């Protein structure tokens, strides 16, 4: 009956954060307390939620968006907020209801002379929709001035690798990142309790 | 899960050519677009060309009419041809998968282990 979070948050490989994974969740009976003050997790901020009520309470889907950013970051994956992420490869929506989990992740997703594999969208045409995600591979016109499609001048490659290393310093440290994010439009309650 | 692995680097004589080959195996649910980047020594590791699933190329101002990117799919197999090679092009040169889609599936992308290419006068 119990629901499927440590393949979410025990995953062996985590999100690139333009590329940001979901699993809903549903049909299954949520014990949330090994999350809130399980207390390996460094943030924890919820929004429209008192972290205790939530723990008897139902939902029609629970949402569940896996990814990985820089610590200075976090920030940012919040409501109001702006700047590189919130702009361009997670948004989240003004009147948010949800939890925002992460922890530091250096001793796993930094390598000795850097993991290229998590990343993130530098520029993009406009700013993201709430849970809007984009995965171009397609030049960005910085100028007025045309690409040729050849990057170049004004004329920049749209995704970059963060490359953590353990050297780092802790802002630019990885960190992992759950947004549990609730809903409850109009047809059946699928998950609570106990 | 997608190992890639890249081939056919080396020494050569400035002027000279290669040809280099992305091997791919066993593949997810999606084609990928797909990139060459290199790491001249030194300078950290930055883009060299792509090849998209709808098969426009672009390429970084560098390597403009001198390198050629193209994929053989029923090899599975990427080629980077490069002409009038000079030492600035020397680099650990490196392959890439990118992110694609397809309905909740959400394959990340992934690098090979590269192939050192070598020029000199």
């Known amino acids: 009956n119990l629901c499927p979070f440590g393949e979410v948050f025990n995953a062996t490989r985590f999100a690139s954060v333009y590329a940001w994974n979901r699993k809903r969740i549903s049909n299954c009976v949520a014990d949330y307390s090994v999350l809130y003050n399980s207390a390996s997790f460094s943030t924890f901020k919820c929004y429209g939620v008192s972290p205790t009520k939530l723990n008897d309470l139902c939902f029609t889907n629970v949402y569940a968006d896996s990814f990985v950013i820089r610590g200075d970051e976090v920030r940012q994956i919040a409501p109001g907020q702006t700047g590189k992420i919130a702009d361009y490869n997670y948004k989240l929506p003004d009147d948010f209801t949800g939890c925002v989990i992460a922890w530091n992740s250096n001793n796993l997703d930094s390598k000795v002379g850097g993991n290229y594999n998590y990343l993130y969208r530098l520029f993009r045409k406009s700013n993201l929709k709430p849970f809007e995600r984009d995965i171009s591979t397609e030049i960005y016109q910085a100028g007025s001035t045309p690409c040729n499609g050849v990057e170049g001048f004004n004329c920049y490659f749209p995704l970059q690798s963060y490359g953590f290393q353990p050297t780092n310093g802790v802002g630019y440290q990885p960190y992992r990142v759950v947004v549990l994010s609730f809903e409850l439009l109009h047809a059946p309650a699928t998950v609570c309790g106990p | 899960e997608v190992q890639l692995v890249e081939s056919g680097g080396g020494s050569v004589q400035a002027g000279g050519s290669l040809r280099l080959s992305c091997v791919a195996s066993?593949?997810?649910?999606?084609?990928?677009?797909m990139s060459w980047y290199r790491q001249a020594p030194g300078k950290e590791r930055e883009f060299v060309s792509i090849?998209?699933?709808?098969?426009?190329?672009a390429y970084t101002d560098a390597v403009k009419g001198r390198f050629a990117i193209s994929r053989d799919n029923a090899k599975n197999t990427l080629y980077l041809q490069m002409n009038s090679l000079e030492p600035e092009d020397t680099a650990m040169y490196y392959c890439?998968?990118?992110?694609?889609?397809?309905?909740?599936?959400?394959?990340?992308?992934?690098w090979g282990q590269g192939t050192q290419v070598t020029v000199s006068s």
């Open positions: 090849i998209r699933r709808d098969g426009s190329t």
């Open positions: 890439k998968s990118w992110a694609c889609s397809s309905g909740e599936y959400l394959y990340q992308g992934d």
């Open positions: 066993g593949y997810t649910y999606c084609s990928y677009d």
